[PDB]
């Protein structure tokens, strides 16, 4: 705290701080003189979920139409890692069925399978005070 | 258990196991988190990845309802001898 | 945040004078993950909420948070779906009883003032929990004009020029506060536009004519109607072109 | 922690755990699917036999709450039967008051409020069953509503309740249910049930089938054995 | 635990422990076997005596002229249920002048037993019933659980060590339909023998048999009247 | 309505609420009753005698009827309810059977009323024990004692309160046919029993008597002081 | 419903739930009542957290009869229940006596309702304190009904947030010769010390009672009184 | 239900009713209330705790209540609970002992069944012969010649136990005794008339007179006592 | 799970967990080490630990069903002299709400009984009565039932 | 406590029912013997003080002229059961003009047991089980009959049943002395022999009760002179 904002002024030194529990942080650390900006990396919205899916499902080999919108509707509450898991689990269903490609059905199971796994997760909505 | 394993046969008596054998819980704060880890380590030694050895443990408590379900499981506490009031 | 006894399990006061159970009912409104926005204009009131249909298996014609309490009064429900229907059914019964007992349509202000009275009992008696839902009635009064009233689980109620309930209530409130500061008596088209924009800007969705529901009441026709997808598309097209 | 011992206490995150725990009983029961086709609704329940001693027809998860409305249940069977009687008495009262068969939308909205009434007080516990109500009429048309232990009633085109609901839903989505009829759906409903059944897990299931549509003159009846066996043969062949 | 003290508390695993605890009262009761044929439905019960100077507790109770049950569990709760089914069977005769169908009776006690498993401060009926009856639909064997869930069974055994009888019933379930009355009762006695320890044997003192058939009223047989049935079966290996 | 099981069985088989009520009796003033030949006697220790207290209002010896009176030990408020309930039933029995209530009947009703409060929802047990004395229609003296459980027994002489055990031990040794030969000797037995726990003397002794075909008579302090002198005088000649 | 009292005596002889109810009162909006020679004034801070709220939709100062008024400090929903009960109680008095209910009599009836919820089963005490003003027998009346159910006759009092200093402010600023208009001036001054920000005609609510009866001052009227402050 | 039930009407392991005892502690922190019986009248002196100078004086008395034409009562404890009991007391009204017994049956009822908390009020009753009564939340009632309830009741009773000459007291002697007892019980060394509340009950012309002494009359009693106390200082 | 407190907390253990959160998925993607995690109470675990990048698959281990329980007892009776009349199907029906450890303990306890009575072969009755010991039901005189 | 009255143990036991069964072991020992010549009922008064009148301790109660009951456990609780038995009897006589069977009388009293509840119960409903075991003995169409009742509502006919503190010891002695074909005098004598061995005090004609219900004859309370005749032997 004395180095971010103390007697000696910090010049040309920038600090990026990351945490999923900003509620537990000290008020002095969260003070605007030290952490001026509190950038909220929130859970992806409908468009944000769609963008992340194409990022991770890009290198996936697939034939047939892939309805990314259908995945997005069932992806509500997912994070970026969950959408990558949907791509991973979709291929896992292809490998399980001895396929060299992933179809929309495989994606349909994967997004549903990950959705069941989200029931084990506790409260995530934590914000700085 | 490391010192118990340095012997061919051993007996460990845990009198009043309920002091550390209480069931795990989450009360928001760190309620009994450290003591639960002690029970978790004891549970790990009784039945974990590594074989326990030739140790036969003996636990005594007057409050068995408070014990953790994993500690009250066969492989850690196989026999549950009840000392009921004499007839 | 001190506690003493069952102050977190039943509706009894905390040592600092707080009803945690009632407060927890407010966090229950956000469990549905939907945001509703209501805006009142010079001669109309508009309620706008997002409708989420996760799968094509669901009949989208049934997933509606817009309810016609009576002909001249409509509401949008936010929170638990099961608790929302009970409040709507309770509100319909009180509206019908008011019509039978008093001979005229129940005013919008008195409709939740009754509903807030029912929900206040839940916050005082300990054998039942508060209803985790938020009610926003909109209707055209005979003299006062368009009216908007939010009706919270705590039994609080107040009139609003433009209000919002749900996960993004405070994000949408700041947006509506800015628009109201400009002091424009919006027409019917503008109220729908600012209500759709408020939900669009806060959520950043760029709504399609299947993802929100719009319910309007106007002075010319003091009846509550749900905007169809064709009607809702006209406003979205107008939003895009400007 | 004490936040989950009653239905009248809210969790600090604003969730009623007793209602959520009651939903887990539904997720422990066998799956029951219902698909709304163009001209009716077909109900298919995977009904296991826990032992060979039970007769063919025991633990009927398919009920008849009215002459035109069916009921497929999942979860605790006793509360399913109690809710069936509540739905039965709701339809009887509606006819005895208004003079016609109760609409499915009103029946679903009426039984759900009874289900919801048990999720508010510590004096009672939430119902441990989720059920699907299906009906067909010439005017209203085919309808299919699912009511969960919380009391949420939503119309459906294809719904599944039970432990294999998530896998069954994926198989329902493949179907073009809005165009095919009951006679074609009863084959697919059997196919979905056979696909989602786990033979290495709990096995020896009996396929319970029921439907209501224009082919039954808007009357909910158990699928005839001759058609039911034909649907069973198609489902078994689909598994190769 | 904290989820097992009341019947209105759902466990995190979607279970009601008080209901399951009441279900164990049936398992504490003595074994009873109920099986049916194309024309008969019999109940075979193994009465228990607290001491050799006390009589064996009655286990088969007459409900109606065509419906008979065998209890398993709390005797006081059985009387409360048996009186209820006796009244409902009587009420059908007073109104419809017809025997109450067995299927239509177990539904009533399945709903009567469901109410206490859902309201605060009430307890499930800690008794398990094996209902045998004959009606227009033929012989029936219904098993009633404290969970208010009933099963329409071809042949069921409930009580202590009843699963040994379930094995025998399952093995010989194929020959239950076409066998006559004498063979049907012998099957239940043989099944009830599996629940006994090795040194014990079926005697007239601890065996009760109840029979309901197409043209036969429900009659309960006792020590003197069990002899025509007990002597037929051979000694077990 | 409050419908809660206050009195429940302990795992050992005891009704703790009944036992706790009996503990409140052991905290009350010592009440001693002696059944003589032609007279029945009730002696109650007056605990602490404040000079500013109206002795008329605080009275542990009350008359249920013209031939039955009782002295209690325990919670004063609880006893008055029992006395009024018994007094009402004394008149109900008289209007029905046209005969004054027997000492058994009013003791049975009070005991049954006590037991009802140990097995009813929402009611705690009465925390008082009663020493019921009186004469039957045939003139037989009768003394009865009830306890919060609801059990009643007939006693030749008994004590309830804080010093019950010591007085009953004293009464076990001195209650003889000779000691109840005359009314004065019966009176002196109660005072001797009461003086074993009463420390100051006759000042903390409230004695009331009932003779056959006569109403309950409360002894004035001078009469009690007169009796105490006799025991003190008789103590010297026995030394 | 629960048939057992949720308010019980602490080992140190306190109804603890009542004290916590009073804590809710202390966290409410300030309310100031001054009994002048020719009338009574009731003032409170009706400040909303946004401009979206309709100020005139919900009023903190509500009339009970033609001559009795209420103003509170505590929980808003609880005050509406007590408003209806008091209005119901006033009608019951009016029906049987055909005379408007005396201010003192109404306070006893309202405080009895508040006391009941302290002893009744399965309920919590009201988290408000009611300032009751009225005019009977040509004499002004001002009363305070605490959550406990005890009613005090106040010549000048303040409740809600910062009420301890508001009571002290009234100690050095009130005399029995004050007139109705000066009481309004003093009531606004009492709010101003506890007030944060600026007091407009919409963020405060004033109601007065005189021989003409009780009426809540319109926003136009309050603006004129506020101008004298500055 | 069982979880949230405090079980007010149950027995402690020592045979005590905890709610009754805890309510009796509330009276100990309440205002001091005195009662003295004389040959020509009964008085009821109560300490006034509503002594804020902004508190309006409208009611006839704060803690002194008239039950009927022949009776007056004073309360100590929860004032709200006192209003319930006083309102009931007038409904029952009749002899003085009969009225106290009837209310004490109501108070005892809350300590035995119902599950509600007891009425934390101790009352002193005066009525017409002349008699003074004290009641407790347990419902235990008893007549007194001189007794006190509230703050420093034990200290006041000790003073009465020493200075109350039984039988040979008129109102003036009893009234002077009340001020002197109140002087030591109060923390105030002056005990002005605004901190006390005296009501005297007497029989006149065949009618019972219940009058609350005016502030002027009380100041004479305070002035007389302080001079009488100062007279004893002349001895030392 | 991490928590916000003002007086005390287990900040050291949460620091160790936060380090593990890095190792599973942090600044340096470690995609060459496979991680297996086992716990009894997934409700206690931190949501950041149950993330879909750190623990991609969360496999639920259910109570063994009737078919599994018979398999489990057969597995642990391989090195055991068991008579060819034991009905593991019947034993599985008698072991409702039994986990694998209790099913294994049934075989272990049944060997105790065979040694207790001196038998050199395990019978079905030994398994049947060994279930009672593993069931650990409290002693009761419930002979007045039925 | 947290537990209600109608709560089931993990072993299927009703907690309050089992706890009331433990209350019988604290009561006095009662012995009942069924004999072809009649049913004998014996019980110990358990005199705790010489001043207490033994006549006041009524532990054998006339239910009717043809049926009697012996009580053990909580004597105060048995009064409600006895009163209902004496009311249910004379109600059968009122409606059917005949004496109720001993089995039916025990069955009616048994239904009173387990009729206890905390919530959803009548205001007059009981809160706890009756911690008393009853020994009904009388003569009917089936001849002499002895029935034993327990706080669980389970009633069963017993040839010779001993209840109370020494139930375990007396029952073992009863089995060693009971045969089906004996006389009532032997049954009375054997009950007194067993009681004398189990009593804390010394057996005499004032600290015990003996009751016989013979066919033809009515329920009879043994007097001191009658008691002294059989005690003088053993």
Swiss-Prot record, chain A:
It comes from the Eukaryota. Transmembrane segments: none annotated. It is found in: Cytoplasm; Nucleus. Belongs to the AAA ATPase family. Component of the 26S proteasome, a multiprotein complex involved in the ATP-dependent degradation of ubiquitinated proteins. This complex plays a key role in the maintenance of protein homeostasis by removing misfolded or damaged proteins, which could impair cellular functions, and by removing proteins whose functions are no longer required. Therefore, the proteasome participates in numerous cellular processes, including cell cycle progression, apoptosis, or DNA damage repair. Component of the 19S proteasome regulatory particle complex. The 26S proteasome consists of a 20S core particle (CP) and two 19S regulatory subunits (RP). The regulatory particle is made of a lid composed of 9 subunits, a base containing 6 ATPases including PSMC6 and few additional components. Interacts with PAAF1. This is 26S proteasome regulatory subunit 10B. It comes from Homo sapiens (Human). The gene is PSMC6. The chain holds residues 261 to 389 of 389 of the full protein.
Curated annotation (Swiss-Prot), chain G:
It holds the Pfam family Proteasome_A_N. GO terms for cellular component: cytoplasm; cytosol; extracellular exosome; extracellular region; ficolin-1-rich granule lumen; nucleoplasm; nucleus; P-body. The modification Phosphoserine is found at residues 3, 10, 12. Induction: Down-regulated by antioxidants BO-653 and probucol. Down-regulated in response to enterovirus 71 (EV71) infection (at protein level). InterPro entries: Ntn_hydrolases_N (IPR029055), Proteasome_alpha (IPR050115), Proteasome_alpha-type (IPR023332), Proteasome_asu_N (IPR000426), Proteasome_sua/b (IPR001353). Gene3D superfamilies: Glutamine Phosphoribosylpyrophosphate, subunit 1, domain 1. It is found in: Cytoplasm; Nucleus. Its main location: cytoplasm. GO terms for biological process: proteasome-mediated ubiquitin-dependent protein catabolic process; response to virus. The keyword S-adenosyl-L-methionine does not apply. The modification N6-acetyllysine is found at residues 66, 167. Keywords: Acetylation, Cytoplasm, Nucleus, Phosphoprotein, Proteasome. The 26S proteasome consists of a 20S proteasome core and two 19S regulatory subunits. The 20S proteasome core is a barrel-shaped complex made of 28 subunits that are arranged in four stacked rings. The two outer rings are each formed by seven alpha subunits, and the two inner rings are formed by seven beta subunits. The proteolytic activity is exerted by three beta-subunits PSMB5, PSMB6 and PSMB7. Belongs to the peptidase T1A family. This is Proteasome subunit alpha type-2. It comes from Homo sapiens (Human). The lineage of its organism: Eukaryota, Metazoa, Chordata, Craniata, Vertebrata.
From Swiss-Prot, chain H:
Gene3D superfamilies: Glutamine Phosphoribosylpyrophosphate, subunit 1, domain 1. Its main location: cytoplasm. Keywords: Acetylation, Cytoplasm, Host-virus interaction, Nucleus, Phosphoprotein, Proteasome. The keyword Thylakoid does not apply. It is found in: Cytoplasm; Nucleus. Pfam families: Proteasome (PF00227), Proteasome_A_N (PF10584). GO terms for biological process: proteasome-mediated ubiquitin-dependent protein catabolic process. Induction: Down-regulated by antioxidants BO-653 and probucol. The modification Phosphoserine is found at residues 12, 74, 158. The modification N6-acetyllysine is found at residues 116, 161. GO terms for cellular component: cytoplasm; cytosol; extracellular exosome; intracellular membrane-bounded organelle; nucleoplasm; nucleus; P-body; proteasome complex. InterPro entries: Ntn_hydrolases_N, Proteasome_alpha, Proteasome_alpha-type, Proteasome_asu_N, Proteasome_bsu_CS, Proteasome_sua/b. Component of the 20S core proteasome complex involved in the proteolytic degradation of most intracellular proteins. This complex plays numerous essential roles within the cell by associating with different regulatory particles. Associated with two 19S regulatory particles, forms the 26S proteasome and thus participates in the ATP-dependent degradation of ubiquitinated proteins. Belongs to the peptidase T1A family. PANTHER family: PROTEASOME SUBUNIT ALPHA/BETA. This is Proteasome subunit alpha type-4. It comes from Homo sapiens.
UniProtKB/Swiss-Prot annotation, chain I:
Sumoylated by UBE2I in response to MEKK1-mediated stimuli. Signal peptide: none annotated. It is found in: Cytoplasm; Nucleus. It comes from the Eukaryota. The gene is PSMC3. Component of the 19S proteasome regulatory particle complex. The 26S proteasome consists of a 20S core particle (CP) and two 19S regulatory subunits (RP). The regulatory particle is made of a lid composed of 9 subunits, a base containing 6 ATPases including PSMC3 and few additional components. Interacts with PAAF1. The lineage of its organism: Eukaryota, Metazoa, Chordata, Craniata, Vertebrata. The chain holds residues 294 to 439 of 439 of the full protein. Component of the 26S proteasome, a multiprotein complex involved in the ATP-dependent degradation of ubiquitinated proteins. This complex plays a key role in the maintenance of protein homeostasis by removing misfolded or damaged proteins, which could impair cellular functions, and by removing proteins whose functions are no longer required. Therefore, the proteasome participates in numerous cellular processes, including cell cycle progression, apoptosis, or DNA damage repair. The modification Phosphoserine is found at residue 83. Belongs to the AAA ATPase family. This is 26S proteasome regulatory subunit 6A. Coiled coil: none annotated.
